[PDB]
Amino acid sequence: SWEVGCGAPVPLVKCDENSPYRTITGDCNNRRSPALGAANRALARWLPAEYEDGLALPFGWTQRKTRNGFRVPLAREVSNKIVGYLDEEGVLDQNRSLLFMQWGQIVDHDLDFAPETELGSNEHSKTQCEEYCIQGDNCFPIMFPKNDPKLKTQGKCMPFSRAGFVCPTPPYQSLAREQINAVTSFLDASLVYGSEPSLASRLRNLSSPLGLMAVNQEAWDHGLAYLPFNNKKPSPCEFINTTARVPCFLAGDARASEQILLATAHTLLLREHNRLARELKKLNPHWNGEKLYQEARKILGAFIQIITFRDYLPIVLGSEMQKWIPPYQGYNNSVDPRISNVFTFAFRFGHMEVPSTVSRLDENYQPWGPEAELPLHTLFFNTWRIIKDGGIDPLVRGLLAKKSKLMNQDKMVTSELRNKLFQPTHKIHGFDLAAINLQRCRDHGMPGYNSWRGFCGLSQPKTLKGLQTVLKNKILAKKLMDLYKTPDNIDIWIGGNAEPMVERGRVGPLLACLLGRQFQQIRDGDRFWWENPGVFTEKQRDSLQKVSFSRLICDNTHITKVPLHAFQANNYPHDFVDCSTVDKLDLSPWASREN
Ligand code: HEM
Ligand SMILES: *[C@@H]1O[C@H](CO)[C@@H](O)[C@H](O)[C@H]1NC(C)=O
Ligand SMILES: *[C@@H]1O[C@H](CO)[C@@H](O)[C@H](O)[C@H]1NC(C)=O
Ligand SMILES: *[C@@H]1O[C@H](CO)[C@@H](O)[C@H](O)[C@H]1NC(C)=O
Ligand SMILES: *[C@@H]1O[C@H](CO)[C@@H](O)[C@H](O)[C@H]1NC(C)=O
Ligand SMILES: [Ca+2]
């Protein structure tokens, strides 16, 4: 009966068992269960999947099969009546830099990725889905409600393909459909180095023995390195401007060019590896390429861990932080470090932190050129605006001096994402991330809002007035009840995100509980955690506690004026101090003693 069994598409890997380095796949982290938290296995189920047919059909598939006696609302109707807003005045977060939003996307991309099924290649099925809006198999299109302005302009539907699932990726009947996590569950910089050998080697410089990561040979940022291009076709970064013909970037994660500020962040992280690999050589000229790579990799993975757990999670979770992520008490090998299916939705609170524009700023933190500020939607899959228009430095200044959007019950998701999203294969800046999120909840068999409230030991509202008391909002609760008819049926992404934020944080109680658990588990369940005794030397760890996002920018750009605390709102030159002030990474404790 014990289904430890199923998992056909995985090349079972032997473990070295006393190696000082993480694998690329994340395999061999846990000794008793070596697959635990490895890429290309099922997302963990904190609660049983919920499907129309108990097995695989998403709720809403059959237009006649109620959920608890009620029809589920169209995702695009929920989007339009709740998530959407016109007025970008008053929407900005007075105490979060745009870097707060950006770091979130980075950590999300380190932890999880459930890609679309690849069944449709050399087929018209993707076309027949998009072209004809015909629900079938892995085609689950987002249909427009009547009165939707997109009806008049785009067609009857937005296209949507169900996420990949384990064992068979085609045939019928499994305990329940389980979607894949294609990256490593550990906070291990997999987004820089890859989660597969195949890509991890292609990423590396294997012409020389300095342990360097490949760099662009076509283009340079004032002598500073760019990510190598991705010479695969069709390139969506080419598609968005066929005259510039600047391809998408190649990184450890396939998503690195989805928007110019994520591509930017990816560029900071690569340089930091190269900068480390050449410093390690300096001190230890006797070291080979492999040793340099792995030893640079290991520093960077520690860096992301510290920035995330010390700087980021306290200003997400606020008052709830200590309650879910109590201070570190060493490696526990009985902790599941796997990313849960519900986490990959919980973390999409990020979508309401994305504001409608991006600025480029000069060395005086003033407007860079006559189109310094641009709409978010023109920067999907846009690498040319980096190559042909100032390098990363003017964009890294905008991440310091501009603001994240604040979540708002009346202003959830900017139209730049809710109406104008571009997706690689489809042709138009005409999609809805909110609608996508909701269809995806259903596709993944997500339990409803009260199941999750129940799971987190929170009250479970059954009426309008219960829902009003929890949401502290009569109109939002009303619109929700009008759409869902019972709070039991509310899709967890919007249910969770409707909740007012906890003191000193940027999520409500339900999210703080779901996020809190997951981040506690990936820290506690990780054999290679930086503070885990025996991973670093006690001296290396005093050197490590001094890292800052301030310093990473200083070391890896030509910017000399930084805030101390890069995630809080910071204004220039008041909150901006010189780079010689911040603190460095002393790499002396990595000095190799031959004797
Ligand atoms: C301009 C900014 C962003 C864009 C354009 C964007 C776009 C997307 C898209 C297209 C998806 C795939 C949706 C699906 O097919 O179901 C997605 C998923 C996701 N996004 Fe965002 N996003 C942005 C910012 C963020 C931020 C700031 C965070 C977190 C703080 C975040 C977290 C996620 C997560 C967790 C997923 C699911 C990934 C997975 O496990 O498959 N995103 N995003
Ligand atoms: C590898 O490193 C060498 C020396 O640093 C450099 O000249 C070369 O361009 C690099 N190769 C690639 C493919 O990036
Ligand atoms: C295309 O990129 C080129 C730079 O090669 C730029 O001059 C042009 O204005 C861009 N056009 C669009 C539509 O993005
Ligand atoms: C701004 O954010 C930081 C980070 O949470 C916090 O400690 C600080 O008290 C906040 N300041 C104001 C004035 O809100
Ligand atoms: C390890 O975690 C389990 C459950 O995850 C818990 O019961 C136990 O207290 C922990 N054990 C140690 C050794 O920390
Ligand atoms: Ca990872």
Residue 23 makes CB contacts below 8 A (sequence gap 6+) with 13, 29, 38
Is there a binding annotation on residue 310?
A: no
> Which residues, listed in sequence order, are joined to residue 42 by a DSSP beta bridge?
180
Q: Decide: 330 in ligand 5 pocket, CB within 6 A.
A: no
Are 133 and 103 within 8 A, CB to CB?
A: no
Domain range enclosing 257: 1-595
Are 97 and 402 within 8 A, CB to CB?
A: yes
**Ligand 2 centroid from CA 278, angstroms:** 12
Q: Which tokens in the block code for residue 305?
A: 């861990």
Which letter, b or e, does each residue of 112-150 get, where b requires 16 or more Cβ atoms within 10 Å of its Cβ? bbbebbeebeeeebbeebbeebeeeebbbbbbbbeebeb
- Beta-sheet strands, E only, within 548-587: 561-562, 577-578
Dihedral of alpha carbons 245, 250, 255, 257, sign: negative
Residue 339 makes CB contacts below 8 A (sequence gap 6+) with 37, 43, 44, 111, 112, 181, 185, 518, 522
The residue whose C-alpha atom lies closest to atom 14 belonging to ligand 5 is 332
Are 569 and 94 within 8 A, CB to CB?
A: yes
Q: How far apart are CA 329 and CA 463, in angstroms?
A: 42
Whether 377 is a known active-site residue: answer: no
The label of the residue with tokens 């979060």 reads: 96
Helix H or strand E segment including 142:
strand 142-143
Are 425 and 126 within 8 A, CB to CB?
A: yes
Are 488 and 298 within 8 A, CB to CB?
A: no
Q: Which tokens in the block code for residue 6?
A: 């199923």
Q: Which tokens in the block code for residue 81?
A: 């009546």
- Work out the angle at residue 9's Cα, subtended by the Cα atoms of residues 49 and 4, and round it to the nearest 5 degrees: 55
> Which residues, listed in sequence order, are joined to residue 261 by a DSSP beta bridge?
none
Is there a binding annotation on residue 110?
A: yes
Which amino acids bring their CB within 6 angstroms of ligand 4?
95, 315, 504, 568
SS3 label, residue 380: strand
Q: Which tokens in the block code for residue 369?
A: 């050129």
User: Which of the residues 109, 266, 377, 444 is marked catalytic?
Assistant: 109
Q: Which tokens in the block code for residue 251?
A: 């990184």
Q: How far apart are CA 491 and CA 113, in angstroms?
A: 20
**Ligand 2 centroid from CA 432, angstroms:** 41
- Work out the angle at residue 48's Cα, subtended by the Cα atoms of residues 43 and 51, and round it to the nearest 5 degrees: 95
Q: Would you call 13 exposed, middle or buried from its count of C-beta atoms within 10 A (0-12, 13-18, 19+)?
A: middle
Q: At what angle do helices 464-471 and 474-484 cross, to 10 degrees?
A: 130
- Residue 455: how many CB atoms within 10 A of its CB? 16
Among 363, 370, 390, 365, which residue's Cα sits nearest to residue 260?
390
**Ligand 1 centroid from CA 106, angstroms:** 10
The label of the residue with tokens 């890294």 reads: 396
Is there a binding annotation on residue 429?
A: no
The label of the residue with tokens 């499907």 reads: 51
**Ligand 3 centroid from CA 246, angstroms:** 10
Which amino acids bring their CB within 6 angstroms of ligand 3?
241, 243-244, 384, 388
Print the SS3 string covering 19-79: CCCCCCCCCCCCCCCCCCCCCCEECECCCCCCCCCCCCCCCCCCCCCCECCECCCCHHHHH
Question: Domain of 281: which CATH number?
Answer: 1.10.640.10
Q: How far apart are CA 381 and CA 428, in angstroms?
A: 13
In one-letter notation, the amino acid at residue 48 is P
Would you give the DSSP letter of residue 85?
A: -
Residue 595 makes CB contacts below 8 A (sequence gap 6+) with none
Pick the atom of ligand 5 nearest to 329's CA: 14
SS3 label, residue 193: helix
Are 359 and 373 within 8 A, CB to CB?
A: yes
**Ligand 4 centroid from CA 405, angstroms:** 16
Pick the atom of ligand 5 nearest to 521's CA: 5
The residue whose C-alpha atom lies closest to atom 32 belonging to ligand 1 is 348
Q: How far apart are CA 220 and CA 223, in angstroms?
A: 5
Pick the atom of ligand 5 nearest to 335's CA: 5
The label of the residue with tokens 């990184």 reads: 251
Cis ω for the linkage preceding 234 (within 30 of 0) = yes
Pick the atom of ligand 4 nearest to 318's CA: 5
* 92 phi, psi to nearest 5 deg: -85, 155
Cis ω for the linkage preceding 327 (within 30 of 0) = no
**Ligand 1 centroid from CA 351, angstroms:** 7
Q: How far apart are CA 519 and CA 30, in angstroms?
A: 17
- The conformational region for residue 391 under phi > 0 = left, psi -120 to 50 = alpha, else beta, is left
Helix H or strand E segment including 541:
helix 538-544
**Ligand 1 centroid from CA 445, angstroms:** 19
240, 242, 243, 386, best to mutate for ligand 3 pocket (most atoms within 8 Å of CB): 243
Q: Would you call 163 exposed, middle or buried from its count of C-beta atoms within 10 A (0-12, 13-18, 19+)?
A: buried
Is there a binding annotation on residue 545?
A: no
Q: Decide: 215 in ligand 2 pocket, CB within 6 A.
A: yes
Q: Provide the total of helices (H) and of strands (E) in the chain, helices listed first.
A: 22, 10
- Work out the angle at residue 165's Cα, subtended by the Cα atoms of residues 106 and 155, and round it to the nearest 5 degrees: 80
Largest Cα span, the chain: 77
What total number of domains does the chain contain?
1
Cis ω for the linkage preceding 573 (within 30 of 0) = yes
> Which residues, listed in sequence order, are joined to residue 97 by a DSSP beta bridge?
403
Are 256 and 265 within 8 A, CB to CB?
A: no
Residue 52 makes CB contacts below 8 A (sequence gap 6+) with 58, 59, 60, 61, 62, 65
Are 185 and 339 within 8 A, CB to CB?
A: yes
139, HSE (Cβ side, Cα atoms, 13 Å): 19
Contacts of 86-91 spanning 24+ positions with Cβ under 8 A: 86/415, 87/411, 88/355, 88/356, 88/414, 91/355, 91/356, 91/405, 91/406, 91/408, 91/411, 91/414
Among 331, 352, 324, 356, which residue's Cα sits nearest to residue 259?
356
Q: How far apart are CA 228 and CA 251, in angstroms?
A: 8
Euclidean distance between the first and final Cα of the chain, in Å?
A: 55
CA 224 to chain CA mean position, Å = 26
Q: At what angle do helices 260-283 and 98-111 cross, to 10 degrees?
A: 70
- Residue 201: how many CB atoms within 10 A of its CB? 12
Q: How far apart are CA 492 and CA 514, in angstroms?
A: 11
Question: What is the experimental method?
Answer: X-ray
- Residue 1: how many CB atoms within 10 A of its CB? 3
Report the relative pairing of strands 403-405 and 561-562 from DSSP bridges. Answer: unpaired
Q: Which tokens in the block code for residue 224?
A: 């500073």
- Work out the angle at residue 335's Cα, subtended by the Cα atoms of residues 522 and 11, and round it to the nearest 5 degrees: 75
Report the relative pairing of strands 403-405 and 92-97 from DSSP bridges. Answer: antiparallel
**Which ligand has the nearest atom to the CA of 112?**
1
- Residue 222: how many CB atoms within 10 A of its CB? 10
The residue whose C-alpha atom lies closest to atom 39 belonging to ligand 1 is 113
Pick the atom of ligand 2 nearest to 213's CA: 14
Q: Which tokens in the block code for residue 28?
A: 């061999």
Q: Would you call 389 exposed, middle or buried from its count of C-beta atoms within 10 A (0-12, 13-18, 19+)?
A: middle
Are 96 and 147 within 8 A, CB to CB?
A: no
Q: Which tokens in the block code for residue 381?
A: 């899959």
Print the SS3 string covering 302-347: HHHHHHHHHHHHHHHHHHHHHHHCCCCCCCCCCCCCCCECCHHHHH
> Which residues, listed in sequence order, are joined to residue 213 by a DSSP beta bridge?
204
> Which residues, listed in sequence order, are joined to residue 544 by a DSSP beta bridge?
none
Are 23 and 192 within 8 A, CB to CB?
A: no
Q: Decide: 210 in ligand 2 pocket, CB within 6 A.
A: yes
Pick the atom of ligand 4 nearest to 567's CA: 4
- Work out the angle at residue 465's Cα, subtended by the Cα atoms of residues 463 and 467, and round it to the nearest 5 degrees: 70
Q: How far apart are CA 470 and CA 342, in angstroms?
A: 21
Helix H or strand E segment including 97:
strand 92-97
Helix H or strand E segment including 94:
strand 92-97
201, 203, 212, best to mutate for ligand 2 pocket (most atoms within 8 Å of CB): 212
**Which ligand has the nearest atom to the CA of 386?**
3
Pure H helices in 402-448:
415-418, 433-443
Are 28 and 449 within 8 A, CB to CB?
A: no
Q: How far apart are CA 279 and CA 287, in angstroms?
A: 11
SS3 label, residue 180: strand
Is there a binding annotation on residue 273?
A: no
Q: How far apart are CA 123 and CA 115, in angstroms?
A: 18
Are 512 and 502 within 8 A, CB to CB?
A: yes
How is 110-121 classified by DSSP, letter by letter? HH---PBP-TTT
* 82 phi, psi to nearest 5 deg: -130, -50
